Amino acid sequence: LIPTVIETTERAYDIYSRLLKDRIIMLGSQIDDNVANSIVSQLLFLQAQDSEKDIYLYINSPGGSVTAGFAIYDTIQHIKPDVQTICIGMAASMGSFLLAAGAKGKRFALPNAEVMIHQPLGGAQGQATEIEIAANHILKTREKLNRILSERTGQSIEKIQKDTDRDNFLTAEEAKEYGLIDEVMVPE
Amino acid sequence: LIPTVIETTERAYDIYSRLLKDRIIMLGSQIDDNVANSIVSQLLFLQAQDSEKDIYLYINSPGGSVTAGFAIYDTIQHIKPDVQTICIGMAASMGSFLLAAGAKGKRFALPNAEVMIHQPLGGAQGQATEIEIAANHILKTREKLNRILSERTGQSIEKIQKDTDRDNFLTAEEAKEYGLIDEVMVPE
Amino acid sequence: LIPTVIETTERAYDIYSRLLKDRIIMLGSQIDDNVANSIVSQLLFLQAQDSEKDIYLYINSPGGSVTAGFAIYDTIQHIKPDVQTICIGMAASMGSFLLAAGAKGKRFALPNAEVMIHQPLGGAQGQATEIEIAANHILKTREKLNRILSERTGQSIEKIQKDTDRDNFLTAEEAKEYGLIDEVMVPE
Amino acid sequence: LIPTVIETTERAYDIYSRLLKDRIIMLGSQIDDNVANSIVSQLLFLQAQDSEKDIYLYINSPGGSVTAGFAIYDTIQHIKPDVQTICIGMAASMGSFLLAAGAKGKRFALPNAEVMIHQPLGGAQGQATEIEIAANHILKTREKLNRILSERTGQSIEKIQKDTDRDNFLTAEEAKEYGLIDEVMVPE
Amino acid sequence: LIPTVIETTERAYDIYSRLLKDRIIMLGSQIDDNVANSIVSQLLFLQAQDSEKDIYLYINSPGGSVTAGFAIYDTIQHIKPDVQTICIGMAASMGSFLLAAGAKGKRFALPNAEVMIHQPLGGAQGQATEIEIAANHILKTREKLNRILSERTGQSIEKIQKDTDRDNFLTAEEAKEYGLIDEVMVPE
Amino acid sequence: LIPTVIETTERAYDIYSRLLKDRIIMLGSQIDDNVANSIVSQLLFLQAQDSEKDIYLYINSPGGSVTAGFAIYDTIQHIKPDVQTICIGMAASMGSFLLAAGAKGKRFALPNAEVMIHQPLGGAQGQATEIEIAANHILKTREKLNRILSERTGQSIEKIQKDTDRDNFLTAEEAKEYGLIDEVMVPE
Amino acid sequence: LIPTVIETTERAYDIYSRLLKDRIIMLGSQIDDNVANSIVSQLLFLQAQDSEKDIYLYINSPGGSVTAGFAIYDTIQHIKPDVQTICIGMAASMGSFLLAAGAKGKRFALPNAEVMIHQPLGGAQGQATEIEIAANHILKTREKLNRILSERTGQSIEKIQKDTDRDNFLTAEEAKEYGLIDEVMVPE
Amino acid sequence: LIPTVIETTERAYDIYSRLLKDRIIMLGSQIDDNVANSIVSQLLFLQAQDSEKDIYLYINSPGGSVTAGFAIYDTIQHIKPDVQTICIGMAASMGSFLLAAGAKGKRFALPNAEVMIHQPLGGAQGQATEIEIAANHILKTREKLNRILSERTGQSIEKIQKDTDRDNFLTAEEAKEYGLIDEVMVPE
Amino acid sequence: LIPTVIETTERAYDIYSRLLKDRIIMLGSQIDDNVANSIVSQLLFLQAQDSEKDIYLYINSPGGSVTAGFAIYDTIQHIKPDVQTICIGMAASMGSFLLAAGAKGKRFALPNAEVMIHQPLGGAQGQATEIEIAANHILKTREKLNRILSERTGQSIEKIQKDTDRDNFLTAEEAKEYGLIDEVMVPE
Ligand SMILES: CC(C)n1ncc2cc(C(=O)NCc3coc(-c4cccs4)n3)cnc21
Ligand SMILES: CC(C)n1ncc2cc(C(=O)NCc3coc(-c4cccs4)n3)cnc21
Ligand SMILES: CC(C)n1ncc2cc(C(=O)NCc3coc(-c4cccs4)n3)cnc21
Ligand SMILES: CC(C)n1ncc2cc(C(=O)NCc3coc(-c4cccs4)n3)cnc21
Ligand SMILES: CC(C)n1ncc2cc(C(=O)NCc3coc(-c4cccs4)n3)cnc21
Ligand SMILES: CC(C)n1ncc2cc(C(=O)NCc3coc(-c4cccs4)n3)cnc21
Ligand SMILES: CC(C)n1ncc2cc(C(=O)NCc3coc(-c4cccs4)n3)cnc21
Ligand SMILES: CC(C)n1ncc2cc(C(=O)NCc3coc(-c4cccs4)n3)cnc21
Ligand SMILES: CC(C)n1ncc2cc(C(=O)NCc3coc(-c4cccs4)n3)cnc21
């Protein structure tokens, strides 16, 4: 499942860490607190290595937590390096939020990569105690998500609210037309 | 189950990683997000090692997710190296899609290797909320799969739709006749 | 999930440990006894390495135990180094207590980082035997938490009691206005 | 486990219901909401049958919920009939509360029947959300229990508080001396 | 647990059904769809038996579903008979809603019967698909509950909103002062 | 949970069966094959008892299977008696379909009874084998449901398609305005 | 779920048994050995009651075992009475086999009743030991099913083989056109 | 369970990998996709190391999947090196197929090593959807297995069909007489 | 959860082992046989490294076994080095026994560190066979614990017996006043 790579200078790298040497971060799982903590650590590490060179963030996630996604989001915008974004397989739910969060001019996706811009809700525990706040916290988070998405897609807030309410299935071309990505990555 | 190999120059390789040194990627499991993330990382790694030399992708999968399969597909077509394909045991469901996805002129299969070109459906969660989109997403994905397969097999879209709807069992010779593979790999 | 990093001088670091080399402690999980024991060990370690240089504590926790949180709290205040604090994703329950516990002048949070200053109750086992003490232990702990929070936020004890009783959702700007953090960390 | 009894006038009674015909209620289980609802229904039924004749309540409970116990308590005091009380086996926790709750002059217990006057705490769910109320609700319930017990045992509130805090084991003679029961039921 | 009662005229009644003969409905469990369907059937049955005579509804519920509670509520108001209400043990969450729903002038509670007027939320399934409706459905239901409660308690809507947001613990006297019940049922 | 009722002429009825004697069918559960088989048997039974007198169908269902719902639907329309309909608590998903299916002029609902006219999808097993049919079977069933609903509500097919695609929450007044029910059942 | 019906002459019937008094057999579940044994017992019973009068078999089954289905089939053809057939909800898999097995001229189905004429395979245990027989037993059973179906639908064996291989969804009108049923049962 | 071996030149080998250094592959488990993927990787590795020197394949398997077995089979015949075969303990089901698949003149088995040449059937999932293909796929696979076995044992196809249908237990001498192995490996 | 630390001279340490290099033992879990065996091994190791230099034992345990606690106790007193003690978070049950067991003059605790000096009972298995010994073994162990505690706290045995019978909650100041610790560790 996970192979090893070494070189003469010995030097034990895993396949993901060998890619990290070339400033490539791989994200191929649901966005929980654990993976979010790891992705943030890599982004902070690559900045310390070189603050000028670009970072490559490959995405293949079905979704995850909102608070976990914003941790990755804020880190990407906070650091100096321009974080590139390349969607593969699919970018659904919070994965599409990070897809759009890439550096402007450097948001990519492969031809057969699907996209879905709708976050359903978990994390209902802490809110479920009080009524008035629980309902408003959903609205606040909905306003929080739709505002940030609107700025990056470059579309009106009115259109975002309707699309981000129900389920979606955008292709690479449709995602480019929406403004989520900048270019469909043609072969070679 | 998983043996170790080393050499004098010491240098700990697993059997799969020792094959990766000779640009050989082994795929002998169902295509989920985890293995897809690993296969993509290997394809990106081998390109960085040498963009001209060929890659060998041995396949032995019963199937997997559609979105996971396209992640591997798009990566194979995106990179410069010509990815060879050698089917062993069986190539069913999404495994047969990657079988046909190999570089043109370099798609192989061993004599007693079975082939099956039909993807049943999972991943019904995110779609199950809305009705009109859920049904159409199946049609869109069916049109997505059948179009790409038709191009690589070199057959009409009309024939693909019927064959890829129900179950199939093609031998190495029948798969060659279909256009899925280019040659049956004769002993030695 | 967890990648490796090495360098020539060989030297196997995990991503979290490579950050620990630069005096960065990552906290991206619920605060139980296990993680609390690890965080304390890191704080004691970094003090032994250098008692003058600052420590960076990134927080992304939904909460945890009270006794586990105070173990981290007391350690931060006990050691010489000024422990910086940077909230990412969210800082809820006992996470917000450690958020405010950072060195004065060096308490930060990213723009879209949420904050919640209310600890619900677990650890009901040992108290549940006797009645008079169990109830008073909650009051004592409530007085213990609200007193310490009031000092660091710089607000009255009367206001803290009401806010820390029910659920809350403070943004980076609201948390700064409350006195929990000192500055909202602007990009670059 | 549960036998049947009938008579000529046919008339299917279970052993517990045949005793209910002679105004005898059997209580030989932990006091949950289900049994409490049944005991109250029997007390209300026997009152409707005859409001003057006495009721016999045999007790053999290790304990139960506080709110469930008070439902039986209030019902016993509300109805007209003088509810006799006969402890057998043991009367622990809330069982001893109902033991003392019997009609004055008609509280009994057999020679080898144990008694324990201490309620530990469950039902921590609804209280666990808010801190100040949860602790005070224990004190309120402690004041509620100790006040009512003090009136019926005919001892001071100061003595009750100490005894009802920790575990106890009173024999029939000691329970009579305490004031929980009125007489030890001698053979024949 | 459940005894039998018969009489000469033979005639097999359970203890709950024997009470139903005297127009007494017992409610000593959480208010789900099953018990709600049974309670409604009893209310409709007693109306058919006699539309003029009063019905007695004993309550001992920790809570339940909102939609299940309104089914009992609407049925009580729809039928001709004046449904009396007698709280025992506790009336928490939706139980307190039905407690107040009793006929005006005939709402009772025993001395040590607790009351709690706050419904937390379940039934989050059907709403969780769409965002804008899910949050507003909580507000609509909150407006639905608080409006109806305000009319029956005879207090302002402003006071109800605050009390029904967080947890509560009202005694028989406090519940009478609130307007939830009309009289505390004194012994005999 | 389920009480007994008898009378002198002895005659053991359960509460639901006693209502069935007065031509009242209670439906307070999800519509599966088991309850559907029972409801149909009752409808066929009441027709045999008297084909002229009206039947009363009380509804309190969150939903169920489509094929199970149509079994009840077709039976109601097939038999001679005019089946009245009274919604209580809620009528969601397939429950609202049967709500509208009542005899014309005799479709009722209580004041606080909610309504929801959207069927999500299960029963995906038998369809999941073939692709072209599975998607079209959803469209056929959608056309099947929307056509029948449109006739009974008396609105256009265009409006039904949009409303029955996403989630809904109609009150008694809104359901009356929609045409699902004929009158809101006022007290007494 | 299951109500009771009695009458004066006392006489305890369940709703299904009351229908059995009027020669109506209800089938609303998957066809296993247990229900098959019960259905056969009813068919044999109704013959003994009256061998001339017709029997009414209401069907609402998703499918079941082949051997269990043939037990009901053979019994229907063996007995003298003409067994009517009325499909409700759906008649899938082996249910459609019994649907067509009804007396000629008396095979019915309601307007919105679905039909599916394809049996997938279970009961693989006893066959799985030997290879040559296991495969041929499927062919023998396929020849057994298709031959009998062809006779009753009145179509060719060639057409049956293709339709009964893959999944199907026939409406009442299409099932009538196929020859499975004789008439669509119009309202009243 | 699994020991370590190293040598001076340091060099960490597991016991299985140390044998792989001397071109020995150990197979002591059921033949699933995982072990098949590993065995193939070793065969491909040893060919790359030296295409002329022989490989030693020790077998001790009770059986496994057919498709998994053919993956190992085809690989053995495809590569240049003559793969020796030494049966130990037992070679049942698909293990006996690989036993016979060894290089001609180099098929061995120890004195007390049992042999069984019959594959029962699993992998019934993908076939179970369609009837005509499922049965024929068993026949095709039976023809596939019996044809290949007949060639290597050097016996008629008629004899193989009967023996490979039911269970078998051949000793080392009987297996040699059958043609499965070439020689019984005498001590030293 | 557990990070790595290395240095140039390479040298793989875990965070806990890096602290062990500076004679710091971390105890942040319940005291079972496994952790007790590890703690003893560390104490024996640090003595062998240097018998004169002090050892630092950080405690954060809720409790554990008695026999496991005495194993650590006896080891601390047996070895030459003066084992310092620093309580963090909490020191409950057997943790408080080891808290007091520290070298005289070197027993510490942080400001918000709680303390509880009462061991409840497990390990009831081996004793439960014989009656007279089981009860006396509790008394012997109670005399064993209370005697040793009394010596180190420097208080009477009479006071210890009462306090160590029921539950306790001592703060850092109260624990210092009790004699359990020597000083409250002030910041810096
Ligand atoms: C924390 C908890 C309360 N929670 N959890 C999930 C969740 C979702 C929403 C919500 O409004 N989801 C719709 C939505 C907004 O924005 C996007 C997306 C844009 C881009 C990708 S998704 N979808 C609101 N609160 C939510
Ligand atoms: C996304 C979800 C709706 N989903 N999930 C599975 C799945 C399958 C199909 C589908 O196209 N099934 C038929 C088909 C096409 O192409 C192939 C194959 C070619 C080659 C191998 S399989 N089979 C369509 N949607 C699917
Ligand atoms: C075991 C038992 C003693 N226990 N466990 C948890 C817990 C919590 C409280 C309590 O005071 N909860 C409310 C509160 C105070 O202060 C804060 C917070 C400030 C800052 C973040 S949370 N919330 C009281 N007893 C508790
Ligand atoms: C409401 C919930 C938090 N709860 N649940 C149980 C419980 C018990 C007490 C309590 O005071 N327990 C000690 C006690 C007093 O008096 C008796 C008894 C005397 C005689 C019989 S019982 N025991 C306080 N709150 C409790
Ligand atoms: C429909 C679903 C989302 N749901 N489920 C429960 C629930 C509760 C509320 C709510 O308003 N809860 C607070 C409240 C108001 O009024 C009362 C009560 C007073 C008296 C008795 S209860 N509690 C809102 N939506 C809810
Ligand atoms: C057969 C299987 C695939 N299946 N299962 C459920 C299901 C639902 C639909 C569908 O059209 N759902 C939306 C809808 C239309 O009309 C109503 C309703 C109005 C009123 C009550 S329900 N909802 C289509 N296929 C479905
Ligand atoms: C004995 C065991 C191996 N088994 N179990 C199920 C089963 C099904 C078949 C088969 O032929 N299935 C397809 C088929 C033919 O005809 C119908 C039907 C028409 C109408 C109703 S069913 N479906 C063959 N063997 C089967
Ligand atoms: C594809 C799936 C349906 N499947 N799975 C197992 C399996 C087995 C057979 C079969 O022919 N089994 C008998 C047999 C023939 O030859 C040998 C052997 C000789 C020697 C070793 S095995 N056994 C046919 N289909 C099978
Ligand atoms: C051997 C087995 C039956 N067992 N297991 C636990 C246990 C506890 C005791 C006992 O005496 N518990 C009370 C106590 C005394 O002293 C302390 C403590 C002071 C300080 C720390 S603990 N608690 C007696 N036997 C026990």
I132, with CB counted inside 10 A (0-12, 13-18, 19+), is exposed
What does the alpha-carbon distance between residue H42 and residue H19 come to, in Å, rounded to a whole number?
Answer: 12
Q: Helices F33-49 & F66-78, crossing angle to 10 degrees?
A: 10
Q: Dihedral of the CA atoms I168, I171, I176, I182 (nearest 10)? A: 110
Looking up tokens 């004691």 gives C44
Q: How far is CA D120 from the centre of its chain?
A: 16
Partners of D108 in beta bridges: D86, D183
Ligand nearest to the CA of D134: 4
**Min Cα–Cα distance to chain A from B101, Å:** 13
Q: Is B130:A167 a contact under the CB 8 Å cutoff?
A: yes
Q: Which range of residues forms the domain containing residue A151?
A: 1-188
Looking at residue H153, its amino acid is T
What does the alpha-carbon distance between residue B93 and residue B90 come to, in Å, rounded to a whole number?
Answer: 10
Looking up tokens 């390990």 gives I123
Partners of I115 in beta bridges: I91, I170
Q: What is the SS3 assignment for I157?
A: helix
Partners of B31 in beta bridges: B64
Residue G93 is given by DSSP the state T
Q: Name which of A131, A136, A140 to mutate to probe chain E: the one with the most chain E Cβ atoms within 10 A of its Cβ.
A: A131
Partner residue facing D133 (CB), from E2, E3, E169? E169
- Which value in Å is the resolution of this experimental model? 3.0
Q: What is the SS3 assignment for G58?
A: strand
Ligand 5 contacts CB of residue E119 (under 6 A): yes
What does the alpha-carbon distance between residue B57 and residue C86 come to, in Å, rounded to a whole number?
Answer: 45
What does the alpha-carbon distance between residue B107 and residue B180 come to, in Å, rounded to a whole number?
Answer: 8
Chains that touch I (3 or more CB pairs under 8 A): C
Buried/exposed F28-65: b ≥16 CB within 10 Å, e otherwise = bbbbebebbbbbbbbbbbbbeeeeeeebbbbbbbbbbb
The residues near A41 (Cβ < 8 Å, ≥ 6 apart) are C15, C16, C19, C26
Give me the catalytic one of D17, D38, D96, D118: D118
C185, with CB counted inside 10 A (0-12, 13-18, 19+), is middle
For residue F146, give the ligand 6 atom closest to its CA. 16
Q: Is H127:B167 a contact under the CB 8 Å cutoff?
A: yes
Angle at I141 between CA I138 and CA I144, to 5 degrees: 150
Partners of I56 in beta bridges: I24, I84
Per-residue three-class SS string for chain B = CCCEECCCCCCCEEHHHHHHHCCEEEECCCECHHHHHHHHHHHHHHHHHCCCCCEEEEEEECCECHHHHHHHHHHHHHCCCCEEEEEEEEEECHHHHHHHCCCCCCEEECCCCEEECCCCCCCCCCCCCCHHHHHHHHHHHHHHHHHHHHHHHCCCHHHHHHHCCCCCCECHHHHHHHCCCCEECCCC
Write the residue with the smallest CA distance to atom 3 of ligand 7.
Answer: G138
Chains that touch D (3 or more CB pairs under 8 A): C, E
- CA neighbor of A138 nearest in space, from C179, E70, E157, E121: E121
Partners of G114 in beta bridges: G90
Per the structure, the count of domains in chain C is 1
Question: Tokens representing A1?
Answer: 């499942």
DSSP letter for each residue of I99-146: HHTSPTT-EEE-TT-EEE--------TTTTT-HHHHHHHHHHHHHHHH
Q: Name which of I15, I168, I181 to mutate to probe chain C: the one with the most chain C Cβ atoms within 10 A of its Cβ.
A: I15
- Report how far ligand 6's centroid is from the alpha carbon of B123 (Å): 20
Q: What is the SS3 assignment for H73?
A: helix
Write the residue with the smallest CA distance to atom 6 of ligand 8.
Answer: H121
What does the alpha-carbon distance between residue A93 and residue F145 come to, in Å, rounded to a whole number?
Answer: 30
Partners of C61 in beta bridges: C91
φ, ψ dihedrals at G171, nearest 5°? -80, 175
Q: Is A91:E81 a contact under the CB 8 Å cutoff?
A: no
Query: How many residues belong to chain A?
Result: 188
Looking at residue G73, its amino acid is Y
CATH of the domain at C68: 3.90.226.10
Q: Is I17 a catalytic residue?
A: no
A67 touches chain C (CB under 8 A): yes
The residues near A75 (Cβ < 8 Å, ≥ 6 apart) are A39, A40, A43, A44, C88, C110
What does the alpha-carbon distance between residue B43 and residue B26 come to, in Å, rounded to a whole number?
Answer: 11
Contact C187 A144 (CB under 8 A): no
Q: Which of B98, B133, B138 to mutate to test the pocket of ligand 2 (most atoms within 8 A of CB)?
A: B138
Looking at residue H54, its amino acid is D
A138 touches chain E (CB under 8 A): yes
What does the alpha-carbon distance between residue F168 and residue D168 come to, in Å, rounded to a whole number?
Answer: 58
Looking up tokens 């026997």 gives D46
What does the alpha-carbon distance between residue I41 and residue I45 come to, in Å, rounded to a whole number?
Answer: 6
Residues of H forming the active site: 93, 118
Q: Is F97:F69 a contact under the CB 8 Å cutoff?
A: yes
Question: Tokens representing D15?
Answer: 């052993």
As a whole number of Å, the CA-based R_g of chain D is: 17
**Min Cα–Cα distance to chain I from C130, Å:** 7
Q: Is G180:G154 a contact under the CB 8 Å cutoff?
A: no
Ligand 3 contacts CB of residue C145 (under 6 A): yes
A22, with CB counted inside 10 A (0-12, 13-18, 19+), is exposed
What does the alpha-carbon distance between residue E91 and residue E169 come to, in Å, rounded to a whole number?
Answer: 10
What does the alpha-carbon distance between residue A32 and residue I82 come to, in Å, rounded to a whole number?
Answer: 45
Ligand 5 contacts CB of residue E138 (under 6 A): yes
What does the alpha-carbon distance between residue G149 and residue G145 come to, in Å, rounded to a whole number?
Answer: 6
What does the alpha-carbon distance between residue I130 and residue H179 come to, in Å, rounded to a whole number?
Answer: 68
Ligand 3 contacts CB of residue C118 (under 6 A): yes
Q: Is I178:I155 a contact under the CB 8 Å cutoff?
A: yes
**Min Cα–Cα distance to chain A from B45, Å:** 7
Q: What is the SS3 assignment for F25?
A: strand
C166 touches chain I (CB under 8 A): no
Angle at E110 between CA E108 and CA E114, to 5 degrees: 100
Taking every pair of Cα atoms in chain I, the longest distance, rounded to a whole number of angstroms, is: 62
Per-residue three-class SS string for chain A = CCCEECCCCCCCEEHHHHHHHCCEEEECCCECHHHHHHHHHHHHHHHHHCCCCCEEEEEEECCECHHHHHHHHHHHHHCCCCEEEEEEEEEECHHHHHHHCCCCCCEEECCCCEEECCCCCCCCCCCCCCHHHHHHHHHHHHHHHHHHHHHHHCCCHHHHHHHCCCCCCECHHHHHHHCCCCEECCCC
Element spanning H86, H or E: strand H83-92
What does the alpha-carbon distance between residue E60 and residue B100 come to, in Å, rounded to a whole number?
Answer: 68
Q: Dihedral of the CA atoms C134, C140, C145, C146 (nearest 10)? A: 120
What does the alpha-carbon distance between residue I119 and residue I97 come to, in Å, rounded to a whole number?
Answer: 9
- CA neighbor of B11 nearest in space, from C4, A10, C10: A10
Contact G142 H131 (CB under 8 A): yes
Ligand 5 contacts CB of residue E96 (under 6 A): yes
Do chains B and F touch by CB distance (3+ pairs < 8 Å)? yes
- CA neighbor of B137 nearest in space, from A63, A114, F140, A180: A114
Q: How far is CA D155 from the centre of its chain?
A: 19
Per-residue three-class SS string for chain C = CCCEECCCCCCCEEHHHHHHHCCEEEECCCECHHHHHHHHHHHHHHHHHCCCCCEEEEEEECCECHHHHHHHHHHHHHCCCCEEEEEEEEEECHHHHHHHCCCCCCEEECCCCEEECCCCCCCCCCCCCCHHHHHHHHHHHHHHHHHHHHHHHCCCHHHHHHHCCCCCCECHHHHHHHCCCCEECCCC
- Report how far ligand 2's centroid is from the alpha carbon of G165 (Å): 20
Q: Is H54:B49 a contact under the CB 8 Å cutoff?
A: no
What does the alpha-carbon distance between residue B21 and residue B13 come to, in Å, rounded to a whole number?
Answer: 9
- Report how far ligand 4's centroid is from the alpha carbon of F120 (Å): 48
- CA neighbor of D100 nearest in space, from D146, D136, D137: D146
Angle at D14 between CA D13 and CA D17, to 5 degrees: 80
Q: What is the SS3 assignment for F78?
A: helix
- CA neighbor of I59 nearest in space, from I9, I21, I94, I33: I94
- Report how far ligand 2's centroid is from the alpha carbon of B115 (Å): 16
Chains that touch C (3 or more CB pairs under 8 A): A, D, I
**Min Cα–Cα distance to chain F from E20, Å:** 8
Give me the catalytic one of G65, G93, G96, G150: G93
Q: Is H87:H181 a contact under the CB 8 Å cutoff?
A: yes
What does the alpha-carbon distance between residue A140 and residue H59 come to, in Å, rounded to a whole number?
Answer: 64
Ligand 1 contacts CB of residue A66 (under 6 A): yes
Q: Is I152:I179 a contact under the CB 8 Å cutoff?
A: yes
F129 touches chain B (CB under 8 A): yes
Q: Where are the alpha helices (DSSP H) in F22-80?
A: 33-49, 66-78
Per-residue three-class SS string for chain D = CCCEECCCCCCCEEHHHHHHHCCEEEECCCECHHHHHHHHHHHHHHHHHCCCCCEEEEEEECCECHHHHHHHHHHHHHCCCCEEEEEEEEEECHHHHHHHCCCCCCEEECCCCEEECCCCCCCCCCCCCCHHHHHHHHHHHHHHHHHHHHHHHCCCHHHHHHHCCCCCCECHHHHHHHCCCCEECCCC
Nearest residue in E to A141, CA atom: E131
Q: What is the SS3 assignment for G159?
A: helix
**E strands, chain G, where?**
4-5, 13-14, 24-27, 55-61, 83-92, 107-109, 114-116, 183-184
F135 touches chain B (CB under 8 A): yes
DSSP letter for each residue of F91-135: EETHHHHHHHTSPTT-EEE-TT-EEE--------TTTTT-HHHHH
Q: Is D151:C187 a contact under the CB 8 Å cutoff?
A: no
- CA neighbor of A103 nearest in space, from A182, A175, A188: A182
Ligand 4 contacts CB of residue D65 (under 6 A): no
φ, ψ dihedrals at A164, nearest 5°? -80, 5
Q: Is E58:E25 a contact under the CB 8 Å cutoff?
A: yes
What does the alpha-carbon distance between residue A17 and residue A7 come to, in Å, rounded to a whole number?
Answer: 13
What does the alpha-carbon distance between residue D93 and residue D99 come to, in Å, rounded to a whole number?
Answer: 10
Residue G14 is given by DSSP the state E
Element spanning I58, H or E: strand I55-61
Cα dist from I78 to I41, I71, I81, I101, whole Å: 13, 11, 9, 12
The residues near G145 (Cβ < 8 Å, ≥ 6 apart) are G66, G97, G119, G164
What does the alpha-carbon distance between residue I114 and residue I96 come to, in Å, rounded to a whole number?
Answer: 10
Looking up tokens 């205040």 gives C77
- Report how far ligand 7's centroid is from the alpha carbon of G66 (Å): 7
E152 touches chain D (CB under 8 A): no
- CA neighbor of A18 nearest in space, from I9, C4, C47: C4
Q: Is C1:A16 a contact under the CB 8 Å cutoff?
A: no
What does the alpha-carbon distance between residue B56 and residue A8 come to, in Å, rounded to a whole number?
Answer: 24
B71 touches chain A (CB under 8 A): yes
What does the alpha-carbon distance between residue C72 and residue C38 come to, in Å, rounded to a whole number?
Answer: 10
What does the alpha-carbon distance between residue F131 and residue B135 come to, in Å, rounded to a whole number?
Answer: 10
Q: Tell me which residues have their CB closer than 6 angstroms to ligand 2.
A: B 66, 93-94, 96-97, 117-119, 121-123, 137-138, 141-142, 145-146, 149, 164-165; F 131
Looking up tokens 């978990």 gives A122
Question: Tokens representing H38?
Answer: 């590993």
What does the alpha-carbon distance between residue H134 and residue B167 come to, in Å, rounded to a whole number?
Answer: 10
Q: How far is CA H130 from the centre of its chain?
A: 31
Q: Is A130:E166 a contact under the CB 8 Å cutoff?
A: yes
Looking up tokens 């084909």 gives F51
Nearest residue in A to B148, CA atom: A112
Cα dist from H11 to A63, B10, C179, whole Å: 43, 6, 58
Q: How far is CA I70 from the centre of its chain?
A: 9
Q: What is the SS3 assignment for E16?
A: helix
Looking up tokens 């009401």 gives C162
Residue I177 is given by DSSP the state H
Give me the catalytic one of I17, I29, I65, I118: I118
Buried/exposed D75-103: b ≥16 CB within 10 Å, e otherwise = bbbbbebebbbbbbbbbbbbbbbbbbbbb
Ligand 3 contacts CB of residue C164 (under 6 A): yes
Contact B67 A114 (CB under 8 A): yes
G173 touches chain F (CB under 8 A): no
Do chains E and H touch by CB distance (3+ pairs < 8 Å)? no
Backbone region of residue I54 per phi and psi (left: phi > 0; alpha: psi in -120 to 50; beta: other values): beta
Buried/exposed E166-188: b ≥16 CB within 10 Å, e otherwise = bbbbbbbeebbebebbbebbeee
Expressed in angstroms, the distance from the first to the final Cα of chain C is 27
Looking at residue E56, its amino acid is Y
What does the alpha-carbon distance between residue H55 and residue I56 come to, in Å, rounded to a whole number?
Answer: 58
Nearest residue in B to A6, CA atom: B11
